[PDB]
Structure formats: C-alpha cells, structure tokens
Symmetry: C3
Subunit: 225 residues, 3 copies
Amino acid sequence: GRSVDTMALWLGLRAVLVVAGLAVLLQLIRGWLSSKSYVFNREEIARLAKEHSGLDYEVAFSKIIVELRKKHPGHILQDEDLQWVFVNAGGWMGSMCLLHASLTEYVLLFGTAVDTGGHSGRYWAEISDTILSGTFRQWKEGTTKSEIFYPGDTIVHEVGEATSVQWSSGTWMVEYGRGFIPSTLAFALADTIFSTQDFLTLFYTVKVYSKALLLEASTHLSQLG
Amino acid sequence: GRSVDTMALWLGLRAVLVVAGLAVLLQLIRGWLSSKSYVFNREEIARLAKEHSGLDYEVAFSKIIVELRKKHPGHILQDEDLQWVFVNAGGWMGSMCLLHASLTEYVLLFGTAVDTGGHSGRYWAEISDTILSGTFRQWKEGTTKSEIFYPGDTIVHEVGEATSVQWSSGTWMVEYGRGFIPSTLAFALADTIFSTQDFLTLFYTVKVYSKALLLEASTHLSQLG
Amino acid sequence: GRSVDTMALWLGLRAVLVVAGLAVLLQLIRGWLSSKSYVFNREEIARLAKEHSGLDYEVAFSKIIVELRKKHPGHILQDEDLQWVFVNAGGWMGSMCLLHASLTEYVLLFGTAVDTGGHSGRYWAEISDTILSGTFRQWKEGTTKSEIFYPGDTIVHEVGEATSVQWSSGTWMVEYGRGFIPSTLAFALADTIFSTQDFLTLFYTVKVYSKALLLEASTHLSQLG
Ligand SMILES: CC(=O)[C@H]1CC[C@H]2[C@@H]3CCC4=CC(=O)CC[C@]4(C)[C@H]3CC[C@]12C
Ligand SMILES: CC(=O)[C@H]1CC[C@H]2[C@@H]3CCC4=CC(=O)CC[C@]4(C)[C@H]3CC[C@]12C
Ligand SMILES: CC(=O)[C@H]1CC[C@H]2[C@@H]3CCC4=CC(=O)CC[C@]4(C)[C@H]3CC[C@]12C
C-alpha cells in the first residue's frame, strides 16, 4: 500500500544517491591527481585587469591582450584566431574570447550585453573573474544573502564550490581558470546540447579550444626542440 | 513534393501528439488515484507564515520551524538534517530547506538571493507559497497579464496548472505541497541533469528526501508500535 | 603523460568539431533547397502591426487578426482554434497564439508578461518581430553591445544568425517566419523536453501546428478542386 510505495521510493532515492555520490568521488579523484603545469597565476591576471578597469572595457581588452602576449610569448592566440563566441551554460547566456587554454589552465575575456544569471557550475577548477565593467552578483551555497562586486574586484569561484551568478547588461571581465579544465566542458556545452541546439556555436567552441591546445603543443615542442 | 512533406510532417506531429496526450492521461490517472494521507493543511501553514512575515525572514524561519515541531512532533527533520540546497528547475534558480516530505505531502522553506524566473512546473500536486519577504510574480496560462504578490500573500499553484513564476533578489517563502509528490521530481531535477551538471546538489536533494521519508516511516512504525 | 592527454583531448575535440560542422552543413543544405511557397511577406505584416502599435496590444491583436483574415482568406485559423500556449525555448519563457503555419511560413502573436531572455535560436528561417508593446533587446553575435527596440520597430532575425534576446514584462509583438519551418521545432521544444517537462504544453504546440497544417492542406485542395 502506502508503506510499500514509500519503501520503494526510498530504495530508488538511495540508488540515485550512490550514483551521484560515486560520480562526485570520481570527479574529486580525477581532479586532485590531475596535472598542475602553470604558465600564469591568478594574482598576475587580476592585477593586470584591475589596473585597466577604469578604461573603456574594449581598450582594456586590447591592453591586457598586448601585455599577456609580451609576458607569455607563445601562449596566447594570434589575432586571426580571436573570436567572440556565445556561451550558454547553467541557465545564463554570455560570450567569451579565448586567449589561452591548455589541459590545466585557461585565460579568456568574458561578459554579456544582456541581463542574465544562473548556476555557476561545480568542477575541479579554481576560477577567478576580475570585473572591467558592470556588476557581478554572487550568491554562495548555504547562505540566504548575496554579494555584489564592481569594476576592479575579483570573484574567486573555489574548487568544488557552487554559486548562483548574475550579471547586468554591459558586464565584462577577465577570467583565469586553473585546475582540470576538460571537466568543465560538460557544464559549458550542456545548454547548447539540451536547450539552444546551436550547433555552430558548439563548432566555434571546440574549434577555439583545439586551436589553443595546438598552440600549447607547438610551443612545448619548440621549447624542447 | 511540397504536399508530401506537409502530410509527413502532419503524421509525425500526430504521433508526438498522441504520445504527449497519453503521457498526460497517465499523469492524471496516477495522480487522482494516489494516496491522500494529510498531516498538515495549507491554511495552517499559510496562516503561520503570514503571522511572522513582518519579521526578518530568518527569525520567521526559526519561529515557523519551532511551531511546526511543537504542533506535529515526529514529522519535521531535526536540526542536524536541515540544509540549504540549491534548486535549479524550469529555467530558474532558488534554494530550499526541506522540513517535511512524505509520499503525499511536503513542507519546505524556499527562496532566492538572485533575480530569477521560469516555468513553474505542471504536476498532480497543489502547491502553496506564503511570502515572508520579497515579491512573487505569477503569470497564469491563457492570459497576457501577470500579478505580483507581496509579504503575507499566498500563491496557490493548482493541480495541473502551469504558470510562469518570477522572484526578485531576497525573496523568501514557506511552501507546502499536497498531492502525488514523486511526480514532481522529474521537474525538480531536470535542469540539474541537462543544464547545471551539479551532481553534488543532486546528491543533497535525494539525501534530504530520503531522510524525510525515513523519518516518516519511523514515526509511522512508532505510532503502530 | 600530459602531452598524451593533450593529444587525446585534441582528437576528441576534432571529432566533436567535424560532427557539429557536418550538422551545420546538412542544415544549410536542407534549408537552401527547401520549398519557398509564400502567402505573406514580412513587410506587409510589419506595416500592419506598426499601424496598430499605438493601440492597446489586445485591441491591436484583434484588428490585425481581422485584417489578415480579410486579406488572406483560408490561411488563418478560426476563432475556435486560437489559444495562448506557453513557449519555453533557449532559456526564456514567453507565450504564443498561432495564426498561420505551413511548411515554409508561419504567423503568430508572441510575447511575455514576465521579464525573460535567452538564446534566439539558429535555424534556416528569416524571423521578424514587430513590437506592439514593451521593449525588445537584441544582442548580436560577434559584438559586445546590444540594441533596444520599442513599439513600432521590427527586429529581423536573419537566416543562420544567432543572437541573445531579452523582453521586459508586458512585451507583445507580431511575428512572421519564412524559411524551412520544421527545422525550428527542435529549438522550440527542447526546453520543454529537458527543462520544464510540461507535456501538456507540448501537446498544445503540436496540436496547433497540426491544425494549421490541415487548414493549409484543405485550402490547397479547395484551390485545386
Ligand atoms: C563563464 C564560465 O562559467 C567559464 C567556467 C568554465 C569555462 C570554460 C572552461 C573550458 C573552456 C575552454 C575553451 O577553450 C572554450 C571555453 C571553455 C568552455 C570555457 C568557457 C567559459 C567557462 C564555462
Ligand atoms: C520551488 C518548486 O517549484 C517546488 C515544486 C515541487 C518541489 C519539489 C517537491 C518534491 C521534493 C521533495 C524533496 O524532498 C526535495 C525537494 C523537492 C524536489 C521539492 C523542491 C521544490 C519544488 C521543485
Ligand atoms: C519566439 C520564437 O523564437 C519563434 C522562433 C521559431 C518559432 C516556432 C516556429 C515553428 C512553430 C510553428 C507552430 O505551429 C508552433 C509554434 C512554433 C514552434 C514557433 C514558436 C515560436 C518560435 C519558437
């Protein structure tokens, strides 16, 4: 009767429980033992973006790209491969311009010209965003109150952390990610697969990721000979 | 030619039509003949939340939990099992603290620290939300105009009804559901499966549901001996 | 080691790349060689909606429907088949009333009573929306700035184009689509399948599409005898 249905539902819930739990455990295991080859550090990127946050965010874009090319030659994409690509993830819609991406790091420009917001994602990667323009509202897990950050501030999305994020129209930021980068792809592409059906955007995303990987491989080969 | 393609599309549309129609019919059949064991009633919960809506919503949270424990001993989770868990569903993102959940009822605290909104869901369950803080905008099906509710009001999401819901930053409410509760899970988890990929949140959700079910089973066993 | 993982990821990315690329190529091939039987034209619909944008959007709805019935008898649904149906797509939620739909064209009323926004979709179809009330913000691909349109304006979503769209509460518009209409269905239903689980709305959507197709077939049969 009712007790039988309660017990059966409890059994199925425990099934889903152990499935999700072992998925989380595997994510932790793959992430912790992942490689950690670091060309950049988040403080360098944050300071460089903060210095230029008072300028027009596109002038700041240019200046930051030029500085990153000067300080890390061989690790930033040429002008021919820079492209603004929409990003639909976790219920929000923004756009990115990828500057660098390896197995363990990535650097990009990110933002939005529309009001948007949603789930931040939960992956084995430390993400950091320095606002050039607009406002970034972060609502952390386990709290009932949120915080709003402004140009020049840096929000650090910690490893394993999950938040709600919200950006206002005209919000632009410099983003640096460090960790097990491929484990973020499932989050970054899911709304494209199950919501937007925008396969050309998927094409653009994997194209720029592959080009960044090929640049890193080419620079590694040159550094070894 | 063109007529052939029109006819083929019409055939496939009629296929999808009868599939969805029989799905709706099965939802109605499972829901109507579902059990209706009721520990609470929506008027009791609404009045208790309305009385305290003028206080800070966290003080109200505490007072409502204490009253519910006093009036329904054995049917509310202990302090050790209370937890704020994100909820991503129907395009919106909020967070919940589950107080009670059986096969036929549930009681929780719900709200959001970000501006959000989306589809309410359509399930065989009567849902009711009493606002402690913020604003709740409801847009009913078949109308071109929406309504905004304020602290102390109660919105009743009727059985089989579908609306668009929208909450402003800092909106918090007491929610009571009555009907065939498991038929809501597919709606409550879908954005987690196909959008956020946040498997630890899924873990938390099934964990608290299972604990609430086990509490109900334990109290039933004690009441029978 | 690290180079092996980089190479394997590059291989898998190239796999996803060629899959998405050939999907886009097939979309282009199916769209270009698709039929182009045109009962309406977008300038006619835009001018008719612009003329009435200064009136209450429901009075405008009625006047536009009456004019479209007068000028295109046999191609607009009778009063008995008009229905407001929710539309959840690309992360946004609005509602539509379908007036006309064939293999190559469609005419509908669209809008929203909630603040919403998301991905526009990318399909082989030229879409055009004339605002009767509210505001329509369009953010085009490849740009960091967006534009806001007002009552009486027409936004043209070009074939193959992808934008972010955003509508404010109380925004209502007349929409005309021309191209390969079925290729939009996957976008229009995806959030229903993977997010809202609202199968009765899916039922309503395929029902009105099938009725519009049957009306077009019946008028074609009458015109041929
Ligand atoms: C804005 C944001 O949430 C970040 C978090 C993880 C980031 C992704 C990290 C992996 C990645 C590398 C690429 O080369 C393409 C862009 C993507 C897919 C990034 C897009 C922006 C993301 C999704
Ligand atoms: C806020 C909201 O829409 C409500 C409607 C149905 C509710 C769900 C009802 C079933 C359920 C019981 C649980 O024990 C976990 C929370 C959930 C999954 C509830 C989360 C909040 C929901 C999704
Ligand atoms: C508002 C919007 O984006 C438009 C773009 C393509 C449009 C769809 C085009 C195909 C279609 C025809 C129908 O008969 C049902 C409604 C739908 C499913 C339309 C709903 C509104 C859509 C989704």
